[PDB]
Write a protein that binds this ligand. Structure first.
Ligand SMILES: [K+]
Ligand SMILES: [Mg+2]
Ligand SMILES: [Mg+2]
Ligand SMILES: [Mg+2]
Ligand SMILES: [Mg+2]
Ligand SMILES: [Mg+2]
Ligand SMILES: [Mg+2]
Ligand SMILES: [Mg+2]
Ligand SMILES: [Mg+2]
Ligand SMILES: [Mg+2]
Ligand SMILES: [Mg+2]
Ligand SMILES: [Mg+2]
Ligand SMILES: [Mg+2]
Ligand SMILES: [Mg+2]
Ligand SMILES: [Mg+2]
Ligand SMILES: [Mg+2]
Ligand SMILES: [Mg+2]
Ligand SMILES: [Mg+2]
Ligand SMILES: [Mg+2]
Ligand SMILES: [Mg+2]
Ligand SMILES: [Mg+2]
Ligand SMILES: [Mg+2]
Ligand SMILES: [Mg+2]
Ligand SMILES: [Mg+2]
Ligand SMILES: [Mg+2]
Ligand SMILES: [Mg+2]
Ligand SMILES: [Mg+2]
Ligand SMILES: [Mg+2]
Ligand SMILES: [Mg+2]
Ligand SMILES: [Mg+2]
Ligand SMILES: [Mg+2]
Ligand SMILES: [Mg+2]
Ligand SMILES: [Mg+2]
Ligand SMILES: [Mg+2]
Ligand SMILES: [Mg+2]
Ligand SMILES: [Mg+2]
Ligand SMILES: [Mg+2]
Ligand SMILES: [Mg+2]
Ligand SMILES: [Mg+2]
Ligand SMILES: [Mg+2]
Ligand SMILES: [Mg+2]
Ligand SMILES: [Mg+2]
Ligand SMILES: [Mg+2]
Ligand SMILES: [Mg+2]
Ligand SMILES: [Mg+2]
Ligand SMILES: [Mg+2]
Ligand SMILES: [Mg+2]
Ligand SMILES: [Mg+2]
Ligand SMILES: [Mg+2]
Ligand SMILES: [Mg+2]
Ligand SMILES: [Mg+2]
Ligand SMILES: [Mg+2]
Ligand SMILES: [Mg+2]
Ligand SMILES: [Mg+2]
Ligand SMILES: [Mg+2]
Ligand SMILES: [Mg+2]
Ligand SMILES: [Mg+2]
Ligand SMILES: [Mg+2]
Ligand SMILES: [Mg+2]
Ligand SMILES: [Mg+2]
Ligand SMILES: [Mg+2]
Ligand SMILES: [Mg+2]
Ligand SMILES: [Mg+2]
Ligand SMILES: [Mg+2]
Ligand SMILES: [Mg+2]
Ligand SMILES: [Mg+2]
Ligand SMILES: [Mg+2]
Ligand SMILES: [Mg+2]
Ligand SMILES: [Mg+2]
Ligand SMILES: [Mg+2]
Ligand SMILES: [Mg+2]
Ligand SMILES: [Mg+2]
Ligand SMILES: [Mg+2]
Ligand SMILES: [Mg+2]
Ligand SMILES: [Mg+2]
Ligand SMILES: [Mg+2]
Ligand SMILES: [Mg+2]
Ligand SMILES: [Mg+2]
Ligand SMILES: [Mg+2]
Ligand SMILES: [Mg+2]
Ligand SMILES: [Mg+2]
Ligand SMILES: [Mg+2]
Ligand SMILES: [Mg+2]
Ligand SMILES: [Mg+2]
Ligand SMILES: [Mg+2]
Ligand SMILES: [Mg+2]
Ligand SMILES: [Mg+2]
Ligand SMILES: [Mg+2]
Ligand SMILES: [Mg+2]
Ligand SMILES: [Mg+2]
Ligand SMILES: [Mg+2]
Ligand SMILES: [Mg+2]
Ligand SMILES: [Mg+2]
Ligand SMILES: [Mg+2]
Ligand SMILES: [Mg+2]
Ligand SMILES: [Mg+2]
Ligand SMILES: [Mg+2]
Ligand SMILES: [Mg+2]
Ligand SMILES: [Mg+2]
Ligand SMILES: [Mg+2]
Ligand SMILES: [Mg+2]
Ligand SMILES: [Mg+2]
Ligand SMILES: [Mg+2]
Ligand SMILES: [Mg+2]
Ligand SMILES: [Mg+2]
Ligand SMILES: [Mg+2]
Ligand SMILES: [Mg+2]
Ligand SMILES: [Mg+2]
Ligand SMILES: [Mg+2]
Ligand SMILES: [Mg+2]
Ligand SMILES: [Mg+2]
Ligand SMILES: [Mg+2]
Ligand SMILES: [Mg+2]
Ligand SMILES: [Mg+2]
Ligand SMILES: [Mg+2]
Ligand SMILES: [Mg+2]
Ligand SMILES: [Mg+2]
Ligand SMILES: [Mg+2]
Ligand SMILES: [Mg+2]
Ligand SMILES: [Mg+2]
Ligand SMILES: [Mg+2]
Ligand SMILES: [Mg+2]
Ligand SMILES: [Mg+2]
Ligand SMILES: [Mg+2]
Ligand SMILES: [Mg+2]
Ligand SMILES: [Mg+2]
Ligand SMILES: [Mg+2]
Ligand SMILES: [Mg+2]
Ligand SMILES: [Mg+2]
Ligand SMILES: [Mg+2]
Ligand SMILES: [Mg+2]
Ligand SMILES: [Mg+2]
Ligand SMILES: [Mg+2]
Ligand SMILES: [Mg+2]
Ligand SMILES: [Mg+2]
Ligand SMILES: [Mg+2]
Ligand SMILES: [Mg+2]
Ligand SMILES: [Mg+2]
Ligand SMILES: [Mg+2]
Ligand SMILES: [Mg+2]
Ligand SMILES: [Mg+2]
Ligand SMILES: [Mg+2]
Ligand SMILES: [Mg+2]
Ligand SMILES: [Mg+2]
Ligand SMILES: [Mg+2]
Ligand SMILES: [Mg+2]
Ligand SMILES: [Mg+2]
Ligand SMILES: [Mg+2]
Ligand SMILES: [Mg+2]
Ligand SMILES: [Mg+2]
Ligand SMILES: [Mg+2]
Ligand SMILES: [Mg+2]
Ligand SMILES: [Mg+2]
Ligand SMILES: [Mg+2]
Ligand SMILES: [Mg+2]
Ligand SMILES: [Mg+2]
Ligand SMILES: [Mg+2]
Ligand SMILES: [Mg+2]
Ligand SMILES: [Mg+2]
Ligand SMILES: [Mg+2]
Ligand SMILES: [Mg+2]
Ligand SMILES: [Mg+2]
Ligand SMILES: [Mg+2]
Ligand SMILES: [Mg+2]
Ligand SMILES: [Mg+2]
Ligand SMILES: [Mg+2]
Ligand SMILES: [Mg+2]
Ligand SMILES: [Mg+2]
Ligand SMILES: [Mg+2]
Ligand SMILES: [Mg+2]
Ligand SMILES: [Mg+2]
Ligand SMILES: [Mg+2]
Ligand SMILES: [Mg+2]
Ligand SMILES: [Mg+2]
Ligand SMILES: [Mg+2]
Ligand SMILES: [Mg+2]
Ligand SMILES: [Mg+2]
Ligand SMILES: [Mg+2]
Ligand SMILES: [Mg+2]
Ligand SMILES: [Mg+2]
Ligand SMILES: [Mg+2]
Ligand SMILES: [Mg+2]
Ligand SMILES: [Mg+2]
Ligand SMILES: [Mg+2]
Ligand SMILES: [Mg+2]
Ligand SMILES: [Mg+2]
Ligand SMILES: [Mg+2]
Ligand SMILES: [Mg+2]
Ligand SMILES: [Mg+2]
Ligand SMILES: [Mg+2]
Ligand SMILES: [Mg+2]
Ligand SMILES: [Mg+2]
Ligand SMILES: [Mg+2]
Ligand SMILES: [Mg+2]
Ligand SMILES: [Mg+2]
Ligand SMILES: [Mg+2]
Ligand SMILES: [Mg+2]
Ligand SMILES: [Mg+2]
Ligand SMILES: [Mg+2]
Ligand SMILES: [Mg+2]
Ligand SMILES: [Mg+2]
Ligand SMILES: [Mg+2]
Ligand SMILES: [Mg+2]
Ligand SMILES: [Mg+2]
Ligand SMILES: [Mg+2]
Ligand SMILES: [Mg+2]
Ligand SMILES: [Mg+2]
Ligand SMILES: [Mg+2]
Ligand SMILES: [Mg+2]
Ligand SMILES: [Mg+2]
Ligand SMILES: [Mg+2]
Ligand SMILES: [Mg+2]
Ligand SMILES: [Mg+2]
Ligand SMILES: [Mg+2]
Ligand SMILES: [Mg+2]
Ligand SMILES: [Mg+2]
Ligand SMILES: [Mg+2]
Ligand SMILES: [Mg+2]
Ligand SMILES: [Mg+2]
Ligand SMILES: [Mg+2]
Ligand SMILES: [Mg+2]
Ligand SMILES: [Mg+2]
Ligand SMILES: [Mg+2]
Ligand SMILES: [Mg+2]
Ligand SMILES: [Mg+2]
Ligand SMILES: [Mg+2]
Ligand SMILES: [Mg+2]
Ligand SMILES: [Mg+2]
Ligand SMILES: [Mg+2]
Ligand SMILES: [Mg+2]
Ligand SMILES: [Mg+2]
Ligand SMILES: [Mg+2]
Ligand SMILES: [Mg+2]
Lengths: 275, 48
RNA sequence: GCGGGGUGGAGCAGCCUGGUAGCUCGUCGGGCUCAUAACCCGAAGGUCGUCGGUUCAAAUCCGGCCCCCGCAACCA
RNA sequence: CCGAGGGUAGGGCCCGUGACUGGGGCGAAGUCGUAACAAGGUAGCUGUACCGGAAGGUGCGGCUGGAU
RNA sequence: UGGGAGAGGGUGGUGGAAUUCCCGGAGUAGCGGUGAAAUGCGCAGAUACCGGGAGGAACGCCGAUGGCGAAGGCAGCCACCUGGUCCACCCGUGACGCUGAGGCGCGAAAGCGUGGGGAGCAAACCGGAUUAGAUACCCGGGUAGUCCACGCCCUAAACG
RNA sequence: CGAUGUCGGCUCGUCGCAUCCUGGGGCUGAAGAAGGUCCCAAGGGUUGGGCUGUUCGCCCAUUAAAGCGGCACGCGAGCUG
RNA sequence: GAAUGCCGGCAUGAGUAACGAUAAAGAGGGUGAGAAUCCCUCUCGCCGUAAGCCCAAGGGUUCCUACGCAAUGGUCGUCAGCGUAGGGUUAGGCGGGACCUAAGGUGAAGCCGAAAGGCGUAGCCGAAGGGCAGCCGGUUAAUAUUCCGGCCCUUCCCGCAGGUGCGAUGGGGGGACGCUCUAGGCUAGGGGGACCGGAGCCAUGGACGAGCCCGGCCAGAAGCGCAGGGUGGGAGGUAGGCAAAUCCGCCUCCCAACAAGCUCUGCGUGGUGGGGAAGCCCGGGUGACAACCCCCCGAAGCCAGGGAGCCAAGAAAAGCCUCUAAGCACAACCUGCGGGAACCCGUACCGCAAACCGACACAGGUGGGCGGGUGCAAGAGCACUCAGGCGCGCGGGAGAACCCUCGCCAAGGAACUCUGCAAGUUGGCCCCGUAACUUCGGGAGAAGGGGUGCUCCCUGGGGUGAUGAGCCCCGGGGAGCCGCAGUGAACAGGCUCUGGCGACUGUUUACCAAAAACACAGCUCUCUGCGAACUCGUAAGAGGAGGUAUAGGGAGCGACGCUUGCCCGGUGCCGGAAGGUCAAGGGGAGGGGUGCAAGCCCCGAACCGAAGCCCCGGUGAACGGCGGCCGUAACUAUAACGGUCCUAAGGUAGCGAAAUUCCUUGUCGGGUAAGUUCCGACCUGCACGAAAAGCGUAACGACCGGAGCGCUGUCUCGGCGAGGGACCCGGUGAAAUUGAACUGGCCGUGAAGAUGCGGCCUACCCGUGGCAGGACGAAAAGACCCCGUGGAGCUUUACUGCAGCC
RNA sequence: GAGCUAGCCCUGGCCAGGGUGAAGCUGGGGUGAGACCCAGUGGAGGCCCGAACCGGUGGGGGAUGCAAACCCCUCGGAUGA
């Protein structure tokens, strides 16, 4: 349940803040943080290569656990549920009975206190990791690897999920969040359950400053420039696009497809995204 | 108002200094050329 | 100034590529109808804006006058 | 001191009145179509939504105050 | 106190038939539709037939003139929470009742907000026909919506 | 064109007369009072305001009257802009 | 002899403008050839959240003294930041190195690139961040946390005493953190005292007084005291922290749990060492054996790494403690004491400026700390003032025009003007009060109105203390007083009604535009399944992002309310194993050149052969588009209805002479005496119209309209007054410009606007203060226009390449 | 050539004083429990007033300037993009 403010300033009318309820730990695990090089959107050459980025809020990188097959068998208790500024979802601190401490993305339904494991023998229960060839059919899962032992690369954002639609050889059929039906190896670890923090999309940034707090500098339209800068530039008064609308770099932006045709991946995609 | 020249000894040495020149291939020529013209001072006088 | 245009009562093909003027609506005559519409069978009505030229022959090609649509009329 | 009342400023109610605009009522024989009353030629009425020159139409649900 | 019926309600489950689609076989010159047609689809392999897959909505027979609820209303099956009825014994209290301006609550459908979902159907809409016309009636498409949760709306031939 | 600053306003004016007024006459379809019309006359005078950037124009209230023009459509090394 | 030629020299303008803030001056006494300008005194003025003081950067001897005065100093110069000389900067503790890391930089390894070079993990460098040991006073012409004095502390080496499994670039802990609000206790710093010291003073009518004027503290180890931070203890197990591990982590039982103890800091005390005014006498001497006390106010600073709440979720490594390994356990480390050793660099002076950046001793710009008192609601505002520093490096006169800045005005009150431009009004605080509309927050300081000083009388609570006095802080009631006036000076809203545009706070054309433009939360389209798309790069490699479709990119619109209609023929994009065209290649029917031939050589039809274009279907919050003629109603007029040609389809809702309406000041109503503007309506909309979005909308605006109240020098219509210039005297002394000049009016003429030609008229020679009509005045080789087969930016279905992609 | 300017990165610093009074919390009214109302507290915010500081609205001055963008009066933001 998102939390609204009363309109005691012009921008408070629509601003909404997360209710933060399921958070239990109000400071990170010092053991498990490293600094975070804020790029501002510039590469090694120093050139900007992503626009309208920077001057946000400082933040430390909460290390996260995208393998979990690191320790096959060793259980772990749900210590706390914490606020990460580095991703949409929430992070959960786990205390392994190994004594080891790790952070994972908190699925929905996880409560502080439960024990979670990872492996071929794991119970089909939220928080647990298992290779995909061992998860039941049609069980919604998240934090899905893409290739065996290469790291959890899929469904890692707030309120995402992925049902397991079928089985075919050493590969399982995956409805990715987008809708793309895809083959993924059965030997890819995944965590049963939908990601928590579902109420994220309903957050209303509320005012321009709060955008900047996120490292989000103002976006300026091509229609507001000159021809030097952008195809949409120029004109006397306002002016329509006057050509198929383009990126600043020329390529057309409406409906123009750009997945590389000869990508070897295609040989495992079944049904390109929906809607 | 605020003018263009706002002196800074660290900046002046770290930009036009001898060392800042002897690394880039261009910088060396600048020294070479200033040694050909008999420039008394191949680089600015930074007090350090 | 540049472009298109005027043809039975209404609105339009035929002009480029000369000889043949045509489609719908309406007008008239007769049918079904108690009667009107509709609907059916018929028939009428156009010297093609105007004057001159080309031609064996001009709505059709050219020129002039008339009149109607459209575009332009900017720089200080 | 109070005080008829005079004046300054801001309020509430009511009556008249207004370019123009909304429909309503009536008006011996005006124009369009033909929705309703026969299963009125798609049974009707209805709350509601959208739409159409107009009566109306359609959709979702509901009533018989509908016929064989 | 013991007893019975029942689609009364709320949540979590789940089964099968069918429609639509997707992939594969097999196969060919039509399919579809109507008052009769055309639009539409189909030799770029449709329809009809077999297998696998995706998903949603609605529950055939039972089912009836039936049962239930105060009304609006409620129907596959399973489980948990729960309301009002009715029967029997004459056990308990001892007029404690009837009603009800106000108030409060519930309130089909449509509609609205925020999200999901979307097979079938279908306001608006487009096309084909009919027609003098046809902004309709019929046919081919088809968007909201119809559906899950949450918050409004509070109307009715809400009727016996 | 190795630069003659463009409208309108303000300020200061000055000249022309094809006279708005005032002075003097003829004619009048001049009874009187009041006009129409031409003749002479440039000495002086010719208002305040609403609208619009405006010139101009219309309009309100007066007036003897609310003239019209030229001077780089007078006047920015005087202002305004 | 001319090139707005080049270099230099010298004129003109001209003894002209100006002499750099309107904070301000006067006299006396010195010095010296010379004095408004130097030194001293006395008076007078200005700065005092500064114009005072202490740091940093930068400047680089400007510091001090002595002797100078050509030049620099806007005048003068005996003076100086100027010339000459000699002097002057003292550290184990302050700053920076022999410490650590940050962005970044560099870079064994490794990767890449025609060469040059480009990347890169570890590592190394890299601070105004971490870390680390000096405080008070005196002294010097000039240095001082540096020298001296007093009291303290740091680390390295060596020996000695006690203790301990010692030992690390290896594991662990810690270092270690945000924003706002804020407790308790202190200190800095202040105010007062009838108390303590103080050289003194009694004026001019009064005063020998609890009178006046001055001062009343600074540092400090141990110990304690106060206030805080930090911190649980034991055992057993133990697969984790890449070896080891007694450390840490994890689980369990034990007690202990506001606490208390250990530990660290701040404050107080404290051996002890310092200071010490006015006033008087020639920086010093006294005062003085100075006293050194109490109450109050009180931090934004200190205990600190405190607390609480919030969301945007807030550096690293080291010193440091801990655990172990190799080793070694003669050792080694720890705690305590003693001695010994402790290096390199900076240190002067300016430092909101006359020493820095601005060509200048330039009204400009420059980060950090302290910044006292009184009153004013508070404060860093305002006025005054201490300390401290100044009077801005030309002055003396005069009392014209005019200009700047300022003051006041009779009757009128926006009649001014494009516009109330400007200037008035209003002003703080307290209480009374306060509309449409609304998104219920607001509009709102709405509007408007009353109050305000001082005397006395009674009384309400609060901090401190003690519950009392005293100091202090908010108040209340009544009775009086003076003036024209009590926020008596200074600082401090004018308001209302009504339109457009943009939701709003924001951003912007540095140096003519701050707006209606940009942005903006928010809506939609779309791309992208991760070695993502996309961006920079030849690449390597990065960003994206240590993110993963609730995400990331691109584009359009732009809070929010109600909505966003029809057209897919063209154009894009998207889907389409058929069909057609198709390039290299395959193929080699059939020809050719040659040679005695075997051969060698060339040409070469069909037929197979990508994407791409054609062909088919989709797509509007994709580029884009939304008709014409004619007729028809019991009057006129207008057409609900019809006829017809054309399209891919013909503008729906809403709105409309509008930021759009040409004809146009359209017509009608409102307001006004009068209204091309304004508001409200009509609709033949030249030429609105639905995400280059349509119609609204509370609040908001230094945005643009319109009306009104108040008050006005805006005006009728101008008057007087002030000061700084202008004016005269002394000093100093530019500038554009300039063919040469002995440079008049007219009417004419001339390349068509004559001081210069003709004729006439007029005119003695030279200045000065004033005005701007002319010298087609100055300035700038017209920025408009054309010209040039001159250039550059920008577009595209112009041509031809290239990158990229297929 | 980024010692000016513009954006980003790293690390520090600054923002007097005064007004308004969100959620929450406590108590109380209320109910079947509620929603919710009241007072008290608390002290939110690209909130309000206004110095510093960051600006540059309107005017006047200035125009061989004190200045190759400055001066006076006035005006905007000032816990925040
Ligand atoms: K032009
Ligand atoms: Mg939640
Ligand atoms: Mg609210
Ligand atoms: Mg949350
Ligand atoms: Mg760390
Ligand atoms: Mg990053
Ligand atoms: Mg790099
Ligand atoms: Mg980018
Ligand atoms: Mg960027
Ligand atoms: Mg998170
Ligand atoms: Mg994220
Ligand atoms: Mg796989
Ligand atoms: Mg959430
Ligand atoms: Mg969002
Ligand atoms: Mg952020
Ligand atoms: Mg945006
Ligand atoms: Mg933008
Ligand atoms: Mg532009
Ligand atoms: Mg372009
Ligand atoms: Mg364009
Ligand atoms: Mg434009
Ligand atoms: Mg533009
Ligand atoms: Mg335009
Ligand atoms: Mg394009
Ligand atoms: Mg591309
Ligand atoms: Mg600047
Ligand atoms: Mg500055
Ligand atoms: Mg310079
Ligand atoms: Mg430096
Ligand atoms: Mg620097
Ligand atoms: Mg260098
Ligand atoms: Mg370099
Ligand atoms: Mg080289
Ligand atoms: Mg030399
Ligand atoms: Mg050099
Ligand atoms: Mg033809
Ligand atoms: Mg023919
Ligand atoms: Mg015919
Ligand atoms: Mg003929
Ligand atoms: Mg032009
Ligand atoms: Mg009276
Ligand atoms: Mg009918
Ligand atoms: Mg019918
Ligand atoms: Mg019917
Ligand atoms: Mg019907
Ligand atoms: Mg319909
Ligand atoms: Mg029929
Ligand atoms: Mg076919
Ligand atoms: Mg075939
Ligand atoms: Mg589907
Ligand atoms: Mg009984
Ligand atoms: Mg009894
Ligand atoms: Mg419904
Ligand atoms: Mg209802
Ligand atoms: Mg019924
Ligand atoms: Mg010219
Ligand atoms: Mg001109
Ligand atoms: Mg008469
Ligand atoms: Mg004119
Ligand atoms: Mg006119
Ligand atoms: Mg008269
Ligand atoms: Mg002229
Ligand atoms: Mg002139
Ligand atoms: Mg003219
Ligand atoms: Mg003219
Ligand atoms: Mg002139
Ligand atoms: Mg001028
Ligand atoms: Mg002028
Ligand atoms: Mg010559
Ligand atoms: Mg010259
Ligand atoms: Mg030359
Ligand atoms: Mg020269
Ligand atoms: Mg010489
Ligand atoms: Mg000379
Ligand atoms: Mg001279
Ligand atoms: Mg002279
Ligand atoms: Mg002169
Ligand atoms: Mg001057
Ligand atoms: Mg000067
Ligand atoms: Mg001044
Ligand atoms: Mg001054
Ligand atoms: Mg002054
Ligand atoms: Mg002053
Ligand atoms: Mg002497
Ligand atoms: Mg002298
Ligand atoms: Mg003197
Ligand atoms: Mg004197
Ligand atoms: Mg002087
Ligand atoms: Mg002196
Ligand atoms: Mg002060
Ligand atoms: Mg520095
Ligand atoms: Mg000298
Ligand atoms: Mg001399
Ligand atoms: Mg000499
Ligand atoms: Mg000099
Ligand atoms: Mg000077
Ligand atoms: Mg002198
Ligand atoms: Mg001299
Ligand atoms: Mg001398
Ligand atoms: Mg010295
Ligand atoms: Mg050493
Ligand atoms: Mg280092
Ligand atoms: Mg380096
Ligand atoms: Mg340092
Ligand atoms: Mg130190
Ligand atoms: Mg000390
Ligand atoms: Mg030990
Ligand atoms: Mg160690
Ligand atoms: Mg941290
Ligand atoms: Mg810090
Ligand atoms: Mg102290
Ligand atoms: Mg005080
Ligand atoms: Mg006496
Ligand atoms: Mg002490
Ligand atoms: Mg262990
Ligand atoms: Mg002395
Ligand atoms: Mg501070
Ligand atoms: Mg804290
Ligand atoms: Mg916050
Ligand atoms: Mg690091
Ligand atoms: Mg031994
Ligand atoms: Mg050394
Ligand atoms: Mg020193
Ligand atoms: Mg200053
Ligand atoms: Mg300062
Ligand atoms: Mg100085
Ligand atoms: Mg300068
Ligand atoms: Mg010079
Ligand atoms: Mg000076
Ligand atoms: Mg003081
Ligand atoms: Mg006070
Ligand atoms: Mg005050
Ligand atoms: Mg002075
Ligand atoms: Mg005089
Ligand atoms: Mg007056
Ligand atoms: Mg008045
Ligand atoms: Mg006016
Ligand atoms: Mg006037
Ligand atoms: Mg006005
Ligand atoms: Mg004004
Ligand atoms: Mg009102
Ligand atoms: Mg009110
Ligand atoms: Mg009203
Ligand atoms: Mg206020
Ligand atoms: Mg008031
Ligand atoms: Mg008030
Ligand atoms: Mg009173
Ligand atoms: Mg008094
Ligand atoms: Mg004031
Ligand atoms: Mg104010
Ligand atoms: Mg705005
Ligand atoms: Mg809005
Ligand atoms: Mg802009
Ligand atoms: Mg500008
Ligand atoms: Mg510019
Ligand atoms: Mg400029
Ligand atoms: Mg500039
Ligand atoms: Mg502008
Ligand atoms: Mg502004
Ligand atoms: Mg914008
Ligand atoms: Mg906006
Ligand atoms: Mg929106
Ligand atoms: Mg990364
Ligand atoms: Mg996103
Ligand atoms: Mg984006
Ligand atoms: Mg907006
Ligand atoms: Mg826009
Ligand atoms: Mg199309
Ligand atoms: Mg198309
Ligand atoms: Mg198409
Ligand atoms: Mg549209
Ligand atoms: Mg177009
Ligand atoms: Mg088109
Ligand atoms: Mg008629
Ligand atoms: Mg409609
Ligand atoms: Mg209109
Ligand atoms: Mg008009
Ligand atoms: Mg009008
Ligand atoms: Mg309009
Ligand atoms: Mg228009
Ligand atoms: Mg007009
Ligand atoms: Mg008019
Ligand atoms: Mg009209
Ligand atoms: Mg438009
Ligand atoms: Mg558009
Ligand atoms: Mg538009
Ligand atoms: Mg559009
Ligand atoms: Mg509203
Ligand atoms: Mg509004
Ligand atoms: Mg508005
Ligand atoms: Mg504005
Ligand atoms: Mg206007
Ligand atoms: Mg008025
Ligand atoms: Mg005056
Ligand atoms: Mg007078
Ligand atoms: Mg004067
Ligand atoms: Mg004289
Ligand atoms: Mg001189
Ligand atoms: Mg001569
Ligand atoms: Mg002539
Ligand atoms: Mg002449
Ligand atoms: Mg002459
Ligand atoms: Mg001559
Ligand atoms: Mg002569
Ligand atoms: Mg001659
Ligand atoms: Mg004469
Ligand atoms: Mg003069
Ligand atoms: Mg002149
Ligand atoms: Mg002139
Ligand atoms: Mg010139
Ligand atoms: Mg110029
Ligand atoms: Mg030239
Ligand atoms: Mg030229
Ligand atoms: Mg040419
Ligand atoms: Mg030529
Ligand atoms: Mg050319
Ligand atoms: Mg250019
Ligand atoms: Mg190339
Ligand atoms: Mg910079
Ligand atoms: Mg600098
Ligand atoms: Mg910071
Ligand atoms: Mg501040
Ligand atoms: Mg404050
Ligand atoms: Mg309150
Ligand atoms: Mg709370
Ligand atoms: Mg604020
Ligand atoms: Mg200005
Ligand atoms: Mg002003
Ligand atoms: Mg001037
Ligand atoms: Mg200038
Ligand atoms: Mg200023
Ligand atoms: Mg602001
Ligand atoms: Mg900030």
């Amino acid at each position: 349940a998102v939390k609204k403010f009363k309109p005691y300033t012009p921008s408070r009318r629509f601003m909404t803040v997360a209710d933060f309820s399921e958070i239990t730990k109000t400071e990170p695990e010092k053991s498990l943080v490293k600094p975070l090089k804020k790029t501002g959107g510039r590469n090694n050459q120093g050139r900007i290569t992503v626009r309208f980025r920077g001057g946000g809020h400082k933040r430390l990188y909460r290390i996260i656990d995208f393998k979990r097959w690191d320790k096959v068998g060793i259980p772990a208790k749900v210590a706390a549920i914490e606020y990460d500024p580095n991703r949409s979802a929430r992070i959960a601190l786990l205390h392994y009975v190994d004594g080891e401490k790790r952070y994972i993305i908190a699925p929905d339904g996880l409560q502080v206190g439960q024990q979670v494991v990872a492996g071929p023998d794991a119970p089909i229960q939220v928080g647990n990791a298992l290779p995909l060839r061992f998860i039941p059919v049609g069980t919604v899962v998240h934090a899905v690897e893409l290739e065996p032992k290469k790291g959890a690369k899929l469904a890692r954002a707030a309120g995402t999920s992925a049902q397991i639609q079928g089985r075919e050889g050493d590969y399982v059929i995956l409805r990715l969040p987008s809708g793309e039906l895809r083959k993924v190896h059965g030997e890819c670890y995944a965590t049963v359950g939908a990601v928590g923090n579902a109420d994220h999309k309903n957050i209303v940034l509320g005012k321009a400053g709060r955008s900047r707090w996120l490292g989000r500098r103002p976006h300026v339209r091509g229609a507001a420039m000159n021809p030097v800068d952008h195809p949409h530039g120029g004109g006397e008064g306002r002016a329509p696009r006057g050509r198929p609308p383009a990126s600043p770099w020329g390529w057309q932006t409406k409906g123009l497809k750009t997945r590389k045709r000869r990508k070897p991946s295609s040989r495992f995609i079944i049904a390109r995204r929906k809607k | 108002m605020k003018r263009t020249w706002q002196p800074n000894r660290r900046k002046r040495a770290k930009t036009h200094g001898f060392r800042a020149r002897m690394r880039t291939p261009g910088g060396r020529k600048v020294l070479k050329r200033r040694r050909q013209k008999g420039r008394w001072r191949l680089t600015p006088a930074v007090r350090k």
